[PDB]
Short mmCIF file of C-alpha atoms in Angstrom, two decimals:
data_model
loop_
_atom_site.label_atom_id
_atom_site.label_comp_id
_atom_site.label_asym_id
_atom_site.label_seq_id
_atom_site.Cartn_x
_atom_site.Cartn_y
_atom_site.Cartn_z
CA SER A 1 17.78 1.03 -18.65
CA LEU A 2 16.20 1.91 -14.85
CA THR A 3 18.27 5.24 -14.88
CA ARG A 4 15.68 7.98 -14.07
CA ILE A 5 14.33 6.93 -10.95
CA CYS A 6 11.40 8.93 -8.70
CA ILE A 7 9.84 8.75 -5.32
CA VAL A 8 6.56 10.11 -5.10
CA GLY A 9 6.80 12.07 -1.72
CA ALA A 10 8.89 10.81 1.35
CA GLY A 11 6.92 8.71 2.75
CA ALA A 12 7.42 5.81 5.28
CA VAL A 13 7.10 3.25 2.38
CA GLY A 14 8.12 5.58 -0.54
CA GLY A 15 10.49 7.36 1.33
CA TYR A 16 12.34 3.40 2.57
CA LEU A 17 12.52 2.41 -1.17
CA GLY A 18 14.19 5.64 -2.45
CA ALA A 19 16.81 5.28 0.75
CA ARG A 20 17.84 1.89 -0.11
CA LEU A 21 18.49 3.01 -3.66
CA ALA A 22 20.24 5.72 -3.16
CA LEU A 23 22.69 3.36 -0.89
CA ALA A 24 23.01 1.19 -3.61
CA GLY A 25 24.56 4.72 -5.69
CA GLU A 26 21.20 4.65 -7.16
CA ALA A 27 20.59 9.15 -8.48
CA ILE A 28 17.69 9.04 -7.29
CA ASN A 29 14.98 12.07 -8.00
CA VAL A 30 12.21 13.12 -5.36
CA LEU A 31 8.60 14.91 -5.71
CA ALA A 32 7.98 16.33 -2.72
CA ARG A 33 5.73 19.34 -1.40
CA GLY A 34 5.66 21.35 2.22
CA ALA A 35 8.39 20.92 4.81
CA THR A 36 9.67 17.71 3.57
CA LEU A 37 10.78 19.41 -0.28
CA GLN A 38 12.56 21.74 2.57
CA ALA A 39 14.01 19.34 5.14
CA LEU A 40 14.86 16.97 1.88
CA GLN A 41 16.62 20.51 -0.33
CA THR A 42 18.76 20.84 2.47
CA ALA A 43 19.71 17.79 4.89
CA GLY A 44 19.35 15.70 2.24
CA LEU A 45 16.33 12.29 2.50
CA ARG A 46 17.45 10.90 6.29
CA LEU A 47 17.33 6.89 6.82
CA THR A 48 17.64 4.94 10.22
CA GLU A 49 18.25 1.65 10.02
CA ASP A 50 20.25 -0.55 12.45
CA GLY A 51 20.94 2.16 14.93
CA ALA A 52 23.00 4.18 12.24
CA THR A 53 21.68 7.44 10.22
CA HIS A 54 22.56 8.12 6.53
CA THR A 55 22.16 11.27 4.88
CA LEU A 56 21.59 10.90 1.40
CA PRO A 57 21.85 13.73 -1.25
CA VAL A 58 18.58 13.35 -3.51
CA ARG A 59 16.81 15.73 -6.14
CA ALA A 60 13.85 17.09 -4.30
CA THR A 61 11.81 19.69 -6.53
CA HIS A 62 7.72 20.00 -6.68
CA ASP A 63 8.28 20.60 -9.86
CA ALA A 64 7.58 17.59 -12.25
CA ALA A 65 8.07 19.49 -15.45
CA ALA A 66 11.96 20.03 -14.45
CA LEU A 67 12.25 16.49 -13.91
CA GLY A 68 10.57 15.30 -17.18
CA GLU A 69 10.42 11.25 -17.86
CA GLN A 70 11.51 8.79 -15.89
CA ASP A 71 12.73 5.22 -16.20
CA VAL A 72 11.26 4.08 -12.56
CA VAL A 73 8.19 6.21 -10.80
CA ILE A 74 7.92 4.82 -7.00
CA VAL A 75 4.24 5.77 -5.90
CA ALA A 76 3.83 4.56 -2.28
CA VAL A 77 0.68 6.85 -1.18
CA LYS A 78 -2.41 7.12 0.90
CA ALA A 79 -5.49 6.41 -1.11
CA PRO A 80 -7.05 9.76 -0.74
CA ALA A 81 -4.47 11.66 -1.89
CA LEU A 82 -3.77 9.47 -5.10
CA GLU A 83 -6.18 11.39 -6.47
CA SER A 84 -4.02 15.03 -6.30
CA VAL A 85 -1.12 13.11 -6.74
CA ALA A 86 -1.54 11.31 -10.56
CA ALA A 87 -2.58 14.34 -12.51
CA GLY A 88 1.11 16.10 -10.47
CA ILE A 89 3.28 13.19 -12.17
CA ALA A 90 2.12 13.56 -15.36
CA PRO A 91 5.22 14.82 -16.65
CA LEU A 92 7.52 12.03 -14.98
CA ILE A 93 5.46 9.40 -16.74
CA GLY A 94 6.44 8.73 -20.60
CA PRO A 95 6.19 5.38 -23.10
CA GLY A 96 8.47 3.43 -21.48
CA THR A 97 8.20 4.10 -17.90
CA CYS A 98 7.04 1.75 -15.23
CA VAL A 99 5.10 2.86 -12.12
CA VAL A 100 5.95 0.85 -9.40
CA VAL A 101 2.40 1.23 -7.36
CA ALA A 102 3.18 0.12 -3.69
CA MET A 103 0.35 1.13 -1.23
CA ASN A 104 -2.47 -0.40 0.88
CA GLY A 105 -5.88 -1.98 0.43
CA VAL A 106 -7.06 -2.11 -3.39
CA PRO A 107 -4.83 -0.39 -5.58
CA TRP A 108 -7.65 1.26 -8.37
CA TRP A 109 -6.21 -0.55 -11.08
CA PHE A 110 -6.60 -4.17 -9.02
CA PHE A 111 -9.14 -5.66 -11.49
CA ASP A 112 -7.01 -4.96 -15.04
CA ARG A 113 -6.60 -8.69 -15.41
CA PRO A 114 -8.41 -11.85 -16.81
CA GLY A 115 -11.49 -13.11 -14.84
CA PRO A 116 -14.35 -12.07 -12.25
CA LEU A 117 -15.09 -7.68 -12.90
CA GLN A 118 -12.47 -6.99 -15.40
CA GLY A 119 -11.91 -3.34 -15.76
CA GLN A 120 -14.34 -2.10 -12.86
CA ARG A 121 -13.71 0.90 -11.52
CA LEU A 122 -13.45 1.07 -7.82
CA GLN A 123 -15.41 4.05 -6.29
CA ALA A 124 -13.30 3.86 -3.14
CA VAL A 125 -10.34 4.55 -4.75
CA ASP A 126 -11.30 6.06 -7.96
CA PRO A 127 -14.49 7.53 -8.34
CA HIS A 128 -14.48 10.02 -11.09
CA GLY A 129 -11.47 8.07 -12.72
CA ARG A 130 -9.07 10.75 -12.56
CA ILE A 131 -6.35 8.58 -11.48
CA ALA A 132 -6.71 5.33 -13.87
CA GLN A 133 -6.06 7.64 -16.80
CA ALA A 134 -3.12 10.00 -15.09
CA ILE A 135 -1.76 6.75 -14.63
CA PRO A 136 -2.07 3.79 -17.73
CA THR A 137 -2.40 0.31 -16.31
CA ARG A 138 0.11 -0.46 -19.02
CA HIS A 139 2.78 1.43 -17.33
CA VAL A 140 2.08 0.57 -13.68
CA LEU A 141 3.54 -2.66 -12.03
CA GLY A 142 2.05 -3.74 -8.33
CA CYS A 143 3.94 -4.25 -5.50
CA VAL A 144 3.01 -5.20 -1.66
CA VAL A 145 5.53 -4.55 0.82
CA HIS A 146 5.64 -6.77 3.62
CA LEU A 147 8.51 -4.64 6.07
CA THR A 148 7.65 -2.07 8.67
CA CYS A 149 8.86 1.68 8.80
CA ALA A 150 7.60 5.16 9.52
CA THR A 151 8.33 9.15 8.99
CA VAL A 152 10.11 10.19 12.11
CA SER A 153 10.48 13.86 10.79
CA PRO A 154 10.15 15.08 7.24
CA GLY A 155 12.64 13.65 4.78
CA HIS A 156 13.86 11.03 7.60
CA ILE A 157 13.01 7.62 7.94
CA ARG A 158 12.97 5.22 10.34
CA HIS A 159 13.32 1.36 9.31
CA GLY A 160 10.91 -1.11 11.87
CA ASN A 161 11.62 -4.30 10.55
CA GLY A 162 12.32 -6.40 7.48
CA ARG A 163 13.12 -5.96 3.68
CA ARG A 164 10.66 -7.79 1.63
CA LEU A 165 8.59 -6.91 -1.64
CA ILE A 166 6.66 -8.76 -3.93
CA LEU A 167 6.83 -7.47 -7.35
CA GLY A 168 4.09 -8.61 -9.72
CA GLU A 169 2.40 -7.96 -13.15
CA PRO A 170 -1.21 -6.41 -13.15
CA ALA A 171 -2.36 -8.46 -16.33
CA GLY A 172 -0.24 -11.65 -14.50
CA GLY A 173 2.85 -13.92 -15.61
CA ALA A 174 6.43 -12.87 -15.86
CA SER A 175 7.84 -10.08 -18.18
CA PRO A 176 11.33 -9.01 -18.81
CA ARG A 177 10.84 -5.75 -16.69
CA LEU A 178 9.61 -7.72 -13.57
CA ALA A 179 12.72 -9.45 -13.57
CA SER A 180 14.63 -5.93 -14.09
CA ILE A 181 12.70 -4.10 -11.35
CA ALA A 182 13.27 -7.24 -8.92
CA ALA A 183 16.61 -6.94 -9.68
CA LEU A 184 16.97 -3.33 -9.04
CA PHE A 185 15.56 -3.35 -5.65
CA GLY A 186 17.25 -6.68 -4.82
CA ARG A 187 20.57 -4.74 -5.46
CA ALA A 188 19.20 -2.10 -3.18
CA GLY A 189 18.82 -4.95 0.05
CA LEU A 190 15.46 -5.57 -0.79
CA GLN A 191 14.35 -9.23 -1.04
CA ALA A 192 12.04 -8.87 -3.64
CA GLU A 193 10.30 -11.46 -4.76
CA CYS A 194 7.93 -12.48 -7.60
CA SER A 195 4.62 -13.17 -8.57
CA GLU A 196 2.97 -14.90 -11.27
CA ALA A 197 -0.75 -13.15 -9.71
CA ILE A 198 -0.05 -10.06 -7.51
CA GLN A 199 -3.72 -9.87 -7.01
CA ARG A 200 -3.89 -12.89 -4.84
CA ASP A 201 -0.44 -11.68 -3.08
CA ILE A 202 -2.85 -8.17 -2.27
CA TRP A 203 -5.78 -10.10 -1.12
CA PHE A 204 -4.00 -12.51 1.16
CA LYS A 205 -2.31 -9.29 2.98
CA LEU A 206 -5.55 -7.73 2.66
CA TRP A 207 -7.43 -10.40 4.31
CA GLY A 208 -5.50 -10.59 7.58
CA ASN A 209 -5.12 -7.54 7.81
CA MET A 210 -8.62 -6.29 6.90
CA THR A 211 -10.56 -6.15 10.56
CA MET A 212 -7.23 -5.68 12.55
CA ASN A 213 -6.34 -2.02 11.56
CA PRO A 214 -9.73 -1.02 12.26
CA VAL A 215 -10.52 -2.75 15.58
CA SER A 216 -6.74 -0.91 16.82
CA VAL A 217 -8.26 1.94 15.98
CA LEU A 218 -11.79 1.77 17.36
CA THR A 219 -10.13 0.54 20.77
CA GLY A 220 -6.88 1.62 20.79
CA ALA A 221 -6.13 -1.73 21.63
CA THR A 222 -2.42 -3.39 20.65
CA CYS A 223 -2.87 -6.43 18.37
CA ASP A 224 -2.21 -8.84 21.51
CA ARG A 225 -4.62 -7.67 23.17
CA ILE A 226 -7.66 -7.79 20.01
CA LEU A 227 -6.96 -11.19 19.50
CA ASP A 228 -6.76 -12.75 23.48
CA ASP A 229 -10.36 -10.94 23.82
CA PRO A 230 -12.79 -14.13 22.31
CA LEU A 231 -15.76 -12.11 21.55
CA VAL A 232 -13.86 -9.35 19.15
CA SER A 233 -11.77 -12.52 17.96
CA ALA A 234 -15.21 -13.97 16.87
CA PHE A 235 -15.89 -10.85 15.09
CA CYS A 236 -12.61 -10.34 12.95
CA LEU A 237 -13.00 -14.35 11.93
CA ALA A 238 -16.39 -13.58 10.78
CA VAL A 239 -14.98 -10.09 8.74
CA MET A 240 -12.47 -12.36 7.44
CA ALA A 241 -14.95 -14.78 6.34
CA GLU A 242 -16.89 -12.34 4.24
CA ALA A 243 -13.23 -10.87 2.87
CA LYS A 244 -12.54 -14.99 2.02
CA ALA A 245 -16.19 -15.36 0.32
CA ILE A 246 -15.63 -12.20 -1.76
CA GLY A 247 -12.03 -13.16 -2.72
CA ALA A 248 -12.55 -17.22 -3.52
CA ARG A 249 -15.12 -15.28 -6.17
CA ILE A 250 -12.34 -12.39 -7.51
CA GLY A 251 -9.77 -14.99 -8.44
CA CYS A 252 -7.84 -15.19 -5.13
CA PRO A 253 -8.71 -17.97 -3.29
CA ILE A 254 -7.47 -17.94 0.26
CA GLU A 255 -5.95 -21.90 1.19
CA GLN A 256 -4.98 -20.84 4.90
CA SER A 257 -7.94 -20.30 7.39
CA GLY A 258 -8.99 -16.98 9.33
CA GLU A 259 -8.00 -18.79 12.87
CA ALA A 260 -4.79 -20.17 11.84
CA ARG A 261 -3.67 -16.19 10.06
CA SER A 262 -4.90 -14.83 13.52
CA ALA A 263 -1.92 -16.84 15.55
CA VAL A 264 0.60 -15.38 13.34
CA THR A 265 -0.55 -11.97 14.23
CA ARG A 266 -0.43 -12.39 17.62
CA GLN A 267 2.88 -13.96 17.85
CA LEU A 268 3.96 -10.57 16.44
CA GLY A 269 4.13 -8.99 19.88
CA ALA A 270 1.95 -5.78 21.27
CA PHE A 271 2.60 -3.65 18.35
CA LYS A 272 0.26 -1.56 17.17
CA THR A 273 -1.33 -1.22 13.53
CA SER A 274 -0.62 1.18 10.71
CA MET A 275 -3.48 2.61 11.31
CA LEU A 276 -2.67 3.41 14.42
CA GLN A 277 0.80 5.00 13.96
CA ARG A 278 -2.60 12.84 12.05
CA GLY A 279 -3.42 12.21 8.51
CA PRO A 280 -6.11 10.89 6.77
CA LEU A 281 -7.10 7.13 7.78
CA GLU A 282 -6.71 4.87 4.92
CA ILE A 283 -10.20 3.34 5.80
CA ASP A 284 -11.73 3.54 2.11
CA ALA A 285 -8.97 1.38 0.58
CA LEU A 286 -9.11 -0.98 3.38
CA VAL A 287 -12.55 -1.77 4.56
CA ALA A 288 -15.40 0.34 1.70
CA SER A 289 -13.39 -1.06 -1.23
CA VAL A 290 -14.01 -4.68 -0.17
CA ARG A 291 -17.95 -3.99 0.92
CA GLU A 292 -17.56 -2.64 -3.13
CA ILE A 293 -16.43 -5.35 -4.22
CA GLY A 294 -18.74 -7.82 -2.21
CA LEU A 295 -22.17 -5.81 -3.60
CA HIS A 296 -20.59 -6.43 -6.99
CA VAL A 297 -19.90 -9.89 -6.20
CA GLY A 298 -22.51 -11.16 -5.10
CA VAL A 299 -21.37 -11.40 -1.35
CA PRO A 300 -23.87 -10.26 1.27
CA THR A 301 -21.12 -8.38 4.01
CA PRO A 302 -22.87 -6.84 7.49
CA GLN A 303 -20.00 -7.61 9.51
CA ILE A 304 -17.88 -5.56 7.13
CA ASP A 305 -20.82 -2.99 7.38
CA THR A 306 -20.79 -2.84 10.88
CA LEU A 307 -16.87 -2.82 11.02
CA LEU A 308 -16.64 0.29 8.43
CA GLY A 309 -19.74 2.58 9.73
CA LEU A 310 -18.04 2.47 13.54
CA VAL A 311 -14.77 3.19 12.09
CA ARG A 312 -15.45 5.97 9.38
CA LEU A 313 -17.44 7.64 12.40
CA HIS A 314 -14.66 7.35 14.77
CA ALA A 315 -12.60 8.81 12.81
CA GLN A 316 -14.79 11.41 11.45
CA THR A 317 -15.10 12.35 14.93
CA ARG A 318 -11.36 13.31 14.55
CA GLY A 319 -9.87 14.78 11.72
CA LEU A 320 -8.97 11.57 10.25
CA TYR A 321 -11.50 11.10 8.02
#
């Protein structure tokens, strides 16, 4: 059964998934460091949702060995932190362990499915191959998160909006464990949907968010101000066209036009991105990876190149890259 459940860290997404499970009455473990660890051991995991706060007793430790093999490990960390996250969750992973990977951008394991560039190691997310060897792909279940939340203080999560999650097998198609993981998340109030090719849900979410994140940090504008200004709008559509060209060649053709997707994003309101709202920015996973895939797949990327250079220097000036 899916009995031993561990969250790596108590970040926005991971901590939210963990709090929902704890609310459903699961025993949940957290692998945590620093001030997050102390807050979790003393107060519990804290969730504010619908104007109500819950304190959820968890088993929080830095010692993965003490925890041992788990049934479900939830990994929702930023890409630069991963390299130092895998080797850490080595004791949590045994033969039967499902690793639910809920990460932004292109995940390290993305290409482990039949089709174009199968098994291609991406230098932007796992250059020395340390993550794929610490977390073998047969363990992983992919997760695209379509809800929002944030970290208030260490070990305290504030739910933004939504309950939507897409789960899928890296190899593709249905499986017994995909149905059991979805049902588990379903019991925890998550509207967990099952994909037949999760790579296509990864690329779709990426395609409509790929320009919007770095554009919002370079400028500081809200998402409505970006799409109103017709010249930055035309830069977005250009970057999206490069992303769509890369996508259609790697097994993820996109049906929606860039202009129609931009209409959905501006109707969300005048709210910031996850890149805007310290900590190293996820530029590598979100931007550098797509440029890298373009270089492999033959599609030129001068619009993405400009976007990458400008946002890495903006973040290099600060302590964000």
